[PDB]
């Protein structure tokens, strides 16, 4: 059965690495300084980002603030469409019934969002635009209340997440694992989602026991790791709430308010 559950991993990676356009592998040339990548432009205050806007080829007036805010909103929309293509190429996932299709990626894209974004963060800020830029942890922690709030919990987790040193064919099947997630609510069919999902785990188990050898109880240790991801939902969505009564010119994207309502 190992044969299979390493074909499992080896479908997953590649499908991974079909899907998402900015890998893990890419990010970190870019933060450490290889000479695959090129260096970004970084962002740490009023005046570069200024320079930077005219700097950094943006994909997408107002405030600041407001301006990132929005900024984020656009990768997010592109973020989930990419996990949507790769949710796709789980086996057995468009098998499910369409309400359970929809309504595991309701849950899960954002769980998923903030271990990818881990990838392209370290303790001093987090890469943009496809990594032409850096925008600095400080700079976004200094934006007025309540926006400059909203990245320090993303931040915290990215440290101690990338503190497990994953790599991309790790991350495929992890997110694969947080996909098919037979507690979420109003799941109509429970059975068939945990019996992909039990073996998306024992195919993680064995990749993680494979690539990271010397590291014990890794698997354990990334389980675990769903605490801080709830936890951060959580406190986002909170704050959205708070945005959506003081900037009444402001909605969120078509597809995220899809996302959130009546999310828990
Ligand atoms: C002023 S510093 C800041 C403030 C607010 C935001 C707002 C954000 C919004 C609307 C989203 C969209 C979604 O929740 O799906 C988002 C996703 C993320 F990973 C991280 C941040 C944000 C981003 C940065
Ligand atoms: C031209 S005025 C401007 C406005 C906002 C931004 C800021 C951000 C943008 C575009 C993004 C989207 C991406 O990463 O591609 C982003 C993601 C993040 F976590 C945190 C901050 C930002 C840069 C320039």
């Not at 997408?60 to 900024?71: D, L, M, N, P, T």
């Amino acid at each position: 059965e190992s044969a299979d559950l390493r074909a499992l991993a080896k479908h997953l990676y590649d499908s991974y690495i079909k899907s998402f356009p900015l890998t893990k592998a890419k990010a970190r040339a870019i933060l450490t300084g290889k000479t695959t990548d090129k260096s970004p432009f970084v962002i740490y205050d009023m005046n570069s980002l200024m320079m930077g806007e005219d700097k950094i080829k943006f994909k997408h007036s107002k405030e600041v603030a407001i301006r990132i805010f929005q900024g984020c909103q656009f990768r997010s929309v592109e973020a989930v469409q990419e996990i949507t293509e790769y949710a796709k190429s789980i086996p057995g996932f468009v098998n499910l019934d369409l309400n359970d299709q929809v309504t595991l990626l309701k849950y899960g894209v954002h769980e998923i969002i903030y271990t990818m974004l881990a990838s392209l963060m370290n303790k001093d800020g987090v890469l943009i635009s496809e990594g032409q830029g850096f925008m600095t942890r400080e700079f976004l922690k200094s934006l007025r209340k309540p926006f400059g709030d909203f990245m320090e919990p993303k931040f915290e987790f990215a440290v101690k997440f990338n503190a497990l040193e994953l790599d991309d064919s790790d991350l495929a099947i992890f997110i694969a694992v947080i996909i098919l997630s037979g507690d979420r609510p109003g799941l109509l069919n429970v059975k068939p989602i945990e019996d992909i999902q039990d073996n998306l785990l024992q195919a993680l188990e064995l990749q993680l026991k494979l690539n990271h050898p010397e590291s014990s109880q890794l698997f354990a240790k990334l389980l675990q790791k769903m605490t801080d991801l709830r936890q951060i939902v959580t406190e986002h969505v909170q704050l959205l709430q708070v945005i959506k009564k003081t900037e009444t010119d402001m909605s969120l994207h078509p597809l995220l308010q899809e996302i959130y309502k009546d999310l828990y």
